[PDB]
Design a protein around this ligand. Structure first.
Ligand SMILES: *[C@@H]1O[C@H](CO)[C@@H](O[C@@H]2O[C@H](CO)[C@@H](O[C@@H]3O[C@H](CO)[C@@H](O)[C@H](O)[C@@H]3O)[C@H](O)[C@H]2NC(C)=O)[C@H](O)[C@H]1NC(C)=O
Ligand SMILES: CC(C)[C@@H]1NC(=O)C[C@H](O)[C@H](Cc2ccccc2)NC(=O)CCCCCCCCCCCNC1=O
Ligand SMILES: *[C@@H]1O[C@H](CO)[C@@H](O[C@@H]2O[C@H](CO)[C@@H](O)[C@H](O)[C@H]2NC(C)=O)[C@H](O)[C@H]1NC(C)=O
Ligand SMILES: O=[P-]([O-])[O-]
Lengths: 241, 97
């Protein structure tokens, strides 16, 4: 393990609404750039780098997409873990050093609909479960695959239709990253019932930060992800499957 | 060399691992979030109104020999919700043990 000394952090005393009540986790450890740290607090990984506690100033995520798999995932601080990806890493430069933001070339539904047609900006966010895009573009995507609205920009798809949905491909750095219907849909359970959630959510993020697509856990699950602060880049490789 | 931090997966919607804060380490589960830049955990001094705090682990600065007071107020607004509290300083262990 590692011990990061002299880390400034928040002691939470109010948590309004319901977000944190049924959450499995106690808190959040942010790993983006210092530019978006509240109160300009030096982040954990920044403190780790200044204390020379790793040789390579990179960190990497494997996220399992079988909800019952053990292990559930792995964060590797200061390296990559070959156990969890196949083939070579492909890299994209960070475009605004605040979130882990990169340029997205396009989003293509196999049946023909193209979103983000002339390129757009996206962030790579382990802390968002779903893919996120602009409300109007996501609405079009969902109509293309036959999903129907649930609430707050989420959509559902009949589980028996999933296997015949089209693939969706994101183009990043001129290479295609395919998501199968199994990759971009999730099982959800409440009160003994199973439904299939569309893994794209519509949300408009206003300027000046937005608009932004979000490559969430849906994407990072399929594509093992490396976050590199030495070279200000993001790397992707096909995760173990 | 590199440090592995194993994560749990709840329902393909929450991924979280164990960290320590303090000496000796007090363990907490956290999301390792590439979409934000602050670390926080619940305080033992959380308000009685904070229902989430009732059923999560709470940090007690009195039990840590490396705690250094700060006390500055903070408020963080995420896409999914918000929180507030005060800042403190301590040693963070990854993993907890
Ligand atoms: C992605 O980001 C990296 C790092 O910012 C970019 O690398 C940089 O590329 C330029 C060429 O366009 C390099 O230029 C040269 O710099 C030296 C000074 O060291 C100078 O002598 C030359 O006249 C020239 O300007 C720069 O060194 C290079 N940096 C590194 C670390 O290799 C890269 O171009 C970006 N990739 C894309 C696709 O934009
Ligand atoms: C920098 C920080 C202050 C903050 N960062 C996040 O909200 C993203 C984080 O990845 C956050 C982490 C989190 C995980 C679990 C429980 C609560 C929060 N994810 C979400 O809340 C999910 C939805 C995000 C939608 C895009 C954000 C759109 C902008 C929101 C307003 C400005 N606030 C931010 O950008
Ligand atoms: C609370 O913590 C912040 C840091 O997160 C402290 O501010 C830093 O303090 C030292 C001086 O002691 C400076 O070298 C840093 O440059 C400061 N950074 C920033 C961004 O302000 C602050 O002093 C602390 N406050 C209290 C009351 O303890
Ligand atoms: O799944 P466990 O963190 O309750």
């Amino acid at each position: 393990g590692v011990k990061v000394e002299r880390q400034v952090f928040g002691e939470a005393t109010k948590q309004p609404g319901i977000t944190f009540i049924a959450a499995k986790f106690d808190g959040i450890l942010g790993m983006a750039y210092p530019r978006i740290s509240v109160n300009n607090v030096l982040p954990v990984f920044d403190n780790l780098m200044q204390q020379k506690l790793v040789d390579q100033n990179i960190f990497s995520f494997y996220l399992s997409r079988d909800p019952d798999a053990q292990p559930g995932g792995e964060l590797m601080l200061g390296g990559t873990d070959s156990k969890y990806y196949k083939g070579s890493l492909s890299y994209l430069n960070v475009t605004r050093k605040a979130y882990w933001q990169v340029h997205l070339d396009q989003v293509e539904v196999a049946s023909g609909l193209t979103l983000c047609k002339e390129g757009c900006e996206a962030i790579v966010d382990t802390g968002t479960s779903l893919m996120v895009g602009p409300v109007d573009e996501v609405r079009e995507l969902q109509k293309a695959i036959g999903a129907v609205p649930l609430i707050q920009g989420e959509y559902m798809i009949p589980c028996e239709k999933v296997s015949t949905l089209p693939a969706i491909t994101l183009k990043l750095g001129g290479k295609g990253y395919k998501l199968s219907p199994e990759d971009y849909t999730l099982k959800v359970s409440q009160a003994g019932k199973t439904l299939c959630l569309s893994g794209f959510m519509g949300m408009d993020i206003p300027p000046p930060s937005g608009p932004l697509w979000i490559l969430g856990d849906v994407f990072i699950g399929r594509y093992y992800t490396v976050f590199d602060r030495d070279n200000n880049r993001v790397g992707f490789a096909e995760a173990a499957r | 060399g590199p440090i592995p931090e194993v994560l749990k997966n709840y329902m393909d919607a929450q991924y979280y691992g164990e960290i320590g804060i303090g000496t000796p380490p007090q363990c907490f589960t956290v999301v390792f979030d590439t979409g934000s830049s602050n670390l926080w955990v619940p305080s033992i001094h959380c308000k009685l109104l904070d229902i989430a705090c009732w059923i999560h682990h709470k940090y007690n600065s009195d039990k840590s020999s490396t705690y250094v007071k700060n006390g500055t107020s903070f408020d963080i607004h995420y896409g999914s919700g918000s929180l507030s509290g005060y800042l403190s300083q301590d040693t963070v262990s990854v993993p907890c043990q």
